Write a protein that binds this DNA or RNA. Structure first.
Ligand code: ZN
Ligand code: ZN
Ligand code: ZN
Lengths: 101, 633, 595
DNA sequence: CCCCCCCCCCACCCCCCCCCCCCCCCCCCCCCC
DNA sequence: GGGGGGGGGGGGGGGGGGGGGTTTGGGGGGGGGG
């Protein structure tokens, strides 16, 4: 992300994002006083194509035909929109925690 | 926020002195140490925790003092007026006067003793110039006021809608039905916090439905050292009290015409918990109180409860009189005319056969044919006489039903699995009225009783079979209002013959118009209406509770097989097979043979024998023969 | 002159507690338990003189597994540890911490005493758990009260359902926004002990540390709703239920419908009035925090496999209480064996229909077979819906037949079942899967069940002057789905009726028969015996089908013969099909196909 | 066997928090002994 | 040459202000009657 300060038109850039939409804490300009008042420069900021897909336990593998277990999966970039509902897929990637943002 | 103040006609110093005077003086002297001090020695031994105060004791003490010419300031009125405060006064008096224990306790095993001893040691280390606790923490007992007898407002049982706002603070007594009961949960009397940075624990008492936890160590050990230590709650050291809530509703009869039935929350604490259950009709004494919601929420703090509702020698009183099977069968619904062979079979279903390993021991009977003839009353009477009985109908009992299921409590949001009537009848007997009308799930439920002695669940991820070992009594009243009294029952009844084949016996009975038998029945009915007593002479009708002695006693006289019965019952099956060499579905089968064996075993139980008798087989065959000849019509 | 480690609130020395437990964890002999309890007459040196928990620790080290299961009564047998049982029951968290650390310490002690080549680094890496159990009386769920609130308890109950696995942070990971230095913090009683300033003295910036969520380290937690059983309730009112927390590899140790014991510390916690506030509600939530769970060989198998009467021996064992009917019992025994499978469709199933009168014992045979099989189901066909039997509607849930995937499905009253439901069972018998397509739900739901139908002639009796098709009233090709079809009839005969009555009445006299060995033998056969077909079987298969085809038959009979011959070849652990297997499969079919 | 019914499922005060201001403490520098 | 006192910076505490906290219709599935 990239932001411009509300009281001086300096620009912060390459702000790494947590699971929350994250804004700068200090203004880079020592002549400026600001903490936490920003406008996002859309054209300078960088976005990724993103798509959540939910999976459930495979039909032949459920131990006795009971309710399957479920998991949330995140696709990004060129991997988005390759999967489909009802499709049976193999994934690779990282198991991760996600906080209640 | 400044407050005004007013003078009032009371003094809690004077009344505290009166309360401790009563406590250290009174006994029930009309019945000829003090009652209360002796009871507090029982508390000190940790043998008792429920401290009960009788308002009648307070009244007797007041009358004794007034008789001795000094005014007692009517403590009964004060406790009936502002009851909640006098719990605190009575408990303080007890804490100021309770004697030391007599029985040994292994005193160090209580954490409160160790922690308060350690605090005392630490305080002595300080006190060398180098309260100890909030009293509710140390107070182990629970104190309750018990109302005045008839001889005053606490004595009167109020219906719920008579509980008006002016009663708030008074020790009233309420009457109604409990419509709901909570599961028990603990509530904090005193929270104990450890302090991480000094080890000096600190305490917060809780006196509301909510509280906010402590953070910084307020103790002088930290505060004088200006050491801002952090506090952590300990469930080991915190005093919890048992809490439970129950919703009471006024009786359905008390509701004025058109009004909704009014209801109230009862809160109950300490040892008095789980004294109530749903469907109880009960009188409850308690303090009627507000709670934070100007409109207050309100509840009743329960204090005292009044529910509305040897043998092995005593059975000999009937045994010694003789012919007890015939007489006990004649004692089954004596207001119902005749049909003694049917009653004699219905008794054996309560007594039961043998189960062995499996071998299946329950005994079942179907009544069939024309409606009426006091049959539903007979099934209800069996449900009354028999222990572990339940009455149903093929479409009735339409709440939890005869057939089981997974369920929610949709008035709230939780889910639960609960049994139907066939599980309540487990280890007992189930009576199915309107048996002809039950549906496919009901029919498969009784199938599973007969075929597995269970009822099955296969829903919401739960597969389970619940236990349903039970005798069936059943009533297959026919289609189209009347049976055609020369045909097979399958031309008259809805049910499949497969189900009917599982019953040990079937009695088809027809409501024949026939002047002579009509007059015999009518003479019985009119005599019962005329005389109001002894539905027939020489029947010797035993009362229900007394015969339950013998039914329970007979049920446990399990028999052992005799070679005579082994041969005789093989012969009996072969004899009935000759009749089977064919004009109706009463054929001899292994299941009729098992029915004869179980009926015979129930007769062996009733004659209190170990060796089963060929007489038992022949009489079991006689009931089957009467059953088949009935079915043959 | 020294500090003392004390279990807080108790005056128990932790060092003495540790030694008192260590000296039992080693040097305990299982004979001491037989001195404590009943069955003291059955002390046996070669099973009781071992240093029993060192035997456990050595097997545990070879397997490299973290858990030591510990019956609590064993603590009372050993003299130095009797007090420690009471300390455990009253202060379980601290005593269990001591026992865990002592197990790890003893693993080190054993490898250094033996100066073994096993990795010290592995033992040091490994966490070790004690799982104490059999604490005492399984007091009722309804009976728990405030005195229990820190004690170890043990509850019997029914699992209603469970959560998915829930991540529980055990170590937080903090990275400096200024200098990128990283540090780790163990979570203390659910509180992150956040560093207020950066650790590095050359940076030491305040509030500069931030939590890197996915570099924190997490334990596993799961919550399960455990119900009071409907057996134990005062039956006029509802059963209770209690939440339990279960952790790490104890996650998913049980499932919905499991009746279990759980041993754990009883616990209570406050719950917030509003998550935006510290304010707590006065009455605490309660839960049990579990430390152990429990539900509710080949040498013997080889010895039986050599017997000559083994066909009849296994056949009698399925239902010795019922009349011997041994063609039915032999056919069912082949249904329990099953055939084999080939993935290129066909399945190694076997399917049977018990016809005959309603006045006969076939339902009881079905009941015993439903008990014998590992994963079967029982139901009946009258009024049985095509969707209720199979799968029903948001989510689709499996019905009785699908729940019997991989086991016998017993269905009584089968002759009364509607043609629609039979039309669903067509693709069970043909494909062993259900090809659903409804609003939102499309699926081929696999359900590999060996159906055992029980059926009747239409009306009260079988007509002996008619064939089985004309009697049963179900159409011939439906009967041709099944492998074997049988008549069991109530017809009067004083010889059979005497011997049956004797056979039945003998049950009350007496004080491979048992089902436990039968189901074990069938299971071991399924694990080990997968017969291939020899040419001596091929020749009779082709010939016998061509025979009954010009008796007038179909290849479904031939496929039935193949599956039965493979099932027959699972007897005597034979593992190869030959002529005799085909002959008996064909012969039993000749008893059936006569119609 | 076919069609209709009916059942299900779904759409003003008090606490936490943050910002601002003032005082106190601790270090550095200079002078005095 | 070391220790005290004066002066300036930096941090912590305390106070003050502010914001947040069930009926009606429709389709499809499932079961019952003509
Ligand atoms: Zn700026
Ligand atoms: Zn402290
Ligand atoms: Zn840093």
């Amino acid at each position: 992300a990239s932001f411009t300060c509300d009281m001086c038109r300096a620009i912060v850039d390459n702000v790494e994002q947590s699971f929350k939409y994250t804004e700068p804490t200090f203004c880079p300009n020592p002549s400026c006083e600001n903490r936490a008042f920003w406008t996002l420069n859309v054209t300078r900021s960088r976005f990724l194509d993103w798509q959540k897909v939910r999976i459930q336990e495979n039909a032949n593998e459920i131990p006795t035909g009971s309710m399957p277990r479920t998991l949330d999966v995140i696709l990004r970039g060129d991997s988005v929109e390759r999967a489909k509902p009802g499709d049976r897929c193999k994934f690779t990637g990282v198991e991760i925690v996600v906080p209640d943002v | 926020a400044a407050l005004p103040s007013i003078q009032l006609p009371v003094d809690y110093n004077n009344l505290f002195n009166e309360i401790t005077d009563f406590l250290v003086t009174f006994k029930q002297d009309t019945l000829s140490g003090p009652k209360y001090m002796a009871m507090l020695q029982k508390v000190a031994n940790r043998e008792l925790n429920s401290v009960i105060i009788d308002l009648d004791d307070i009244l007797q003490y007041q009358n004794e003092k007034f008789l001795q010419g000094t005014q007692a300031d009517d403590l009964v009125s004060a406790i009936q007026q502002n009851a909640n405060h006098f719990t605190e006064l009575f408990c303080r008096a007890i804490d100021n006067n309770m004697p030391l224990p007599t029985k040994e306790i292994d005193y160090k095993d209580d954490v409160l003793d160790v922690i308060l001893n350690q605090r005392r040691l630490r305080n002595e280390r300080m006190l060398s110039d180098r309260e100890l606790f909030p009293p509710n923490l140390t107070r182990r007992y629970f104190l309750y006021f018990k109302p005045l007898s008839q001889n005053a407002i606490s004595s009167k049982p109020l219906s719920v809608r008579q509980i008006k706002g002016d009663f708030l603070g008074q020790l009233i007594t309420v009457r109604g039905i409990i419509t709901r009961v909570s599961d028990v949960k603990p509530a904090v009397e005193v929270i104990a916090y450890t302090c991480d940075q000094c080890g000096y624990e600190v305490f917060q008492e809780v006196n509301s439905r909510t509280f906010t936890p402590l953070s910084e160590c307020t103790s002088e050990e930290c505060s004088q050292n200006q050491t801002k230590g952090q506090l952590f709650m300990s469930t080991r050291a915190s005093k919890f009290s048992a809490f439970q809530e129950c919703k009471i509703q006024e009786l359905s009869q008390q509701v004025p015409v058109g009004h909704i039935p009014r209801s109230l929350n009862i809160h109950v604490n300490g040892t008095l918990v789980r004294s109530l259950s749903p469907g109880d009709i009960v009188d409850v004494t308690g303090i009627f109180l507000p709670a934070p919601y100007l409109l207050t929420e309100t509840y009743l703090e329960a204090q005292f409860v009044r529910q509305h509702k040897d043998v092995e020698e005593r059975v000999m009183e009937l045994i010694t009189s003789g012919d007890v099977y015939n007489r006990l069968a004649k004692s089954i619904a004596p207001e119902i005319y005749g049909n003694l062979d049917v009653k004699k079979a219905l008794l054996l279903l309560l007594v039961g056969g043998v189960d062995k390993r499996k071998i299946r021991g329950d005994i079942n009977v179907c009544l069939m044919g024309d409606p009426g003839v006091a049959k539903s009353q007979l099934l209800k009477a069996i449900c009354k006489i028999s222990p572990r009985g339940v009455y149903t109908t093929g479409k009735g009992s339409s709440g939890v039903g005869l057939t089981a299921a997974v369920m929610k409590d949709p008035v709230t949001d939780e889910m639960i699995l609960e049994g139907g009537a066939l599980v309540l009848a487990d280890n007992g007997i189930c009576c199915i009225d309107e048996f002809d009308k039950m549906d496919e799930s009901d029919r498969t439920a009784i199938h599973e009783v007969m075929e597995q002695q269970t009822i099955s669940i296969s829903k919401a991820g739960i597969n389970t079979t619940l236990n349903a070992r039970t005798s069936i009594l059943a009533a297959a009243n026919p289609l189209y209002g009347r049976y055609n009294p020369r045909l097979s029952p399958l031309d008259n009844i809805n049910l499949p013959a497969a189900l009917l084949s599982r019953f040990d016996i079937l009695f088809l009975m027809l409501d024949i118009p026939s002047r002579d038998d009509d007059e015999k029945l009518a003479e019985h009915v009119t005599y019962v209406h005329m005389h109001n007593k002894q539905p027939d002479l020489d029947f010797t009708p035993v009362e229900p509770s007394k015969m339950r002695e013998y039914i329970a006693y007979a049920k446990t006289k399990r028999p052992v097989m005799s070679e005579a019965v082994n041969d005789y019952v093989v012969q009996a099956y072969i004899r009935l097979r000759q009749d089977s060499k064919r004009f109706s579905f009463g054929q001899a089968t292994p299941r009729t043979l098992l029915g004869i064996i179980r009926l015979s075993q129930a007769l062996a139980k009733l004659r209190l024998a170990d060796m089963v008798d060929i007489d038992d087989v022949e009489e079991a065959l006689r009931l089957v023969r009467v059953s088949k000849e009935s079915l043959y019509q | 002159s020294e500090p003392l480690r004390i279990i807080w609130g108790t005056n128990v020395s932790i060092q003495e507690c540790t030694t008192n437990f260590r000296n039992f964890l080693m040097s305990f002999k299982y004979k001491f338990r037989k001195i404590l309890d009943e069955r003291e007459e059955f002390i046996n040196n070669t099973t009781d003189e071992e240093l029993y928990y060192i035997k456990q620790l050595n097997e545990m080290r070879e397997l490299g597994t973290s858990n030591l299961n510990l019956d609590a009564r064993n603590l009372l047998a050993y003299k130095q540890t009797e007090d420690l049982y009471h300390q455990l029951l009253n202060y379980p968290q601290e005593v269990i911490s001591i026992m865990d650390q002592t197990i790890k310490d003893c693993m080190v002690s054993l490898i250094v005493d033996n100066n073994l080549d096993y990795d010290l680094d592995e033992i040091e890496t490994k966490f070790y758990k004690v799982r104490p159990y059999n604490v005492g009386s399984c007091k009722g769920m309804r009976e728990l009260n405030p005195n229990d609130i820190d004690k170890l308890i043990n509850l019997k109950g029914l699992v209603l359902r469970s959560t998915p696995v829930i991540p529980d942070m055990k170590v937080a990971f903090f990275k400096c926004n200024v200098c990128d230095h990283t540090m780790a913090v163990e979570i203390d009683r659910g509180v992150i002990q956040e560093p207020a300033r950066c650790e590095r003295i050359d940076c030491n910036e305040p509030n500069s540390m931030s939590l890197i969520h996915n570099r924190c380290s997490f334990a596993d937690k799961q919550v399960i709703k455990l119900q009071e059983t409907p057996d134990f309730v005062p039956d006029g009112q509802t059963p209770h239920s209690i939440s339990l927390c279960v952790y790490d590899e104890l996650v998913d140790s049980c499932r919905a419908g499991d009746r279990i014991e759980v041993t754990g510390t009883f616990r209570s916690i406050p719950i917030r009035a509003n998550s935006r506030q510290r304010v707590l509600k006065s009455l605490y939530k309660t839960y049990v925090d579990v430390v152990h769970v429990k539900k509710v060989d080949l040498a013997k198998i080889r010895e039986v496999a050599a017997r000559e009467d083994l066909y009849s021996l296994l056949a009698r064992s399925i239902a010795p209480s019922i009349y011997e009917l041994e063609d039915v019992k032999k056919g069912i025994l082949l249904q329990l064996f099953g055939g084999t499978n080939k993935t290129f469709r066909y399945r190694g199933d076997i399917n049977i229909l018990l016809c005959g009168d309603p006045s006969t014992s076939k339902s009881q045979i079905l009941q015993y077979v439903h008990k014998i099989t590992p994963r079967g189901v029982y139901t009946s066909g009258k009024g049985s819906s095509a969707v209720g039997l199979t799968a029903y509607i948001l989510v689709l849930e499996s019905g009785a037949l699908v729940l019997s995937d991989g086991g016998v499905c017993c269905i009584d009253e089968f002759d009364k079942m509607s043609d629609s439901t039979r039309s669903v069972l067509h693709e069970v018998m043909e494909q062993q899967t259900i090809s659903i397509a409804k609003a939102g739900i499309i699926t081929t739901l696999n359900a590999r069940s060996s159906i055992l139908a029980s059926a009747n002639p239409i009306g009260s009796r079988y007509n002996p002057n008619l064939p089985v098709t004309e009697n049963i009233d179900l159409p011939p090709p439906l009967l041709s789905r099944f492998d074997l079809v049988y008549l069991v009839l109530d017809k009067v005969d004083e010889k059979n009726d005497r011997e049956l009555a004797k056979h039945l009445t003998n049950l009350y006299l007496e004080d491979v028969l048992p089902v436990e060995f039968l189901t074990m033998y069938i299971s071991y056969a399924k694990e080990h015996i997968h017969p291939i077909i020899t040419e001596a079987a091929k020749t009779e298969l082709v010939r016998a089908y061509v025979g009954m085809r010009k008796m007038t038959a179909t290849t479904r009979q031939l496929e039935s013969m193949i599956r039965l011959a493979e099932a027959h070849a699972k007897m005597k652990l034979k593992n190869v099909v030959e002529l005799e297997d085909v002959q008996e499969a064909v012969r039993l079919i000749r008893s059936a196909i006569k119609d």
